[PDB]
Design a protein around this ligand. Sequence first.
Ligand SMILES: [Zn+2]
Ligand SMILES: [Zn+2]
Length: 158
Amino acid sequence: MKIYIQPLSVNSHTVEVLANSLPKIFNAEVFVLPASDVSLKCYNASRRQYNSTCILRMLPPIKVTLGVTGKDIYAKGMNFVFGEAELGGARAVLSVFRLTTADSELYRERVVKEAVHEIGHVLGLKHCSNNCVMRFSNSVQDVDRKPVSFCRECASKI
Ligand SMILES: [Zn+2]
Ligand SMILES: [Zn+2]
């Protein structure tokens, strides 16, 4: 498995977190693509948020490609989303905007959890109700309560 991280208006240090954490989690070769600013095509001026579905479309369809942004994102019908993924496809996007917090270590932990969650969807995993990183999180309090690891059921399916 190969994972391509596409920085899209994001702190380079946060990208490094993912480059350093994801290989072991996915037993994958990880590539960091050249940084770019997230496309203004995907900016909703009324909401001052970027549409995640728009961002996904602009990523290369190379499994697995994860776009990562510091901008707040939303998808249709949602006030915000942490991310959006093609289930069993090639592409996902993560926003770290809603994860911001004072404790650097907690921020880091949230970033890894939510990246792993998105990539799990690309690998074909639906939301999981177990003690699992694939749980849906309504808020960052939910993110903090779920683990970074896949449950035994989800791990068996990758
Ligand atoms: Zn999800
Ligand atoms: Zn699970």
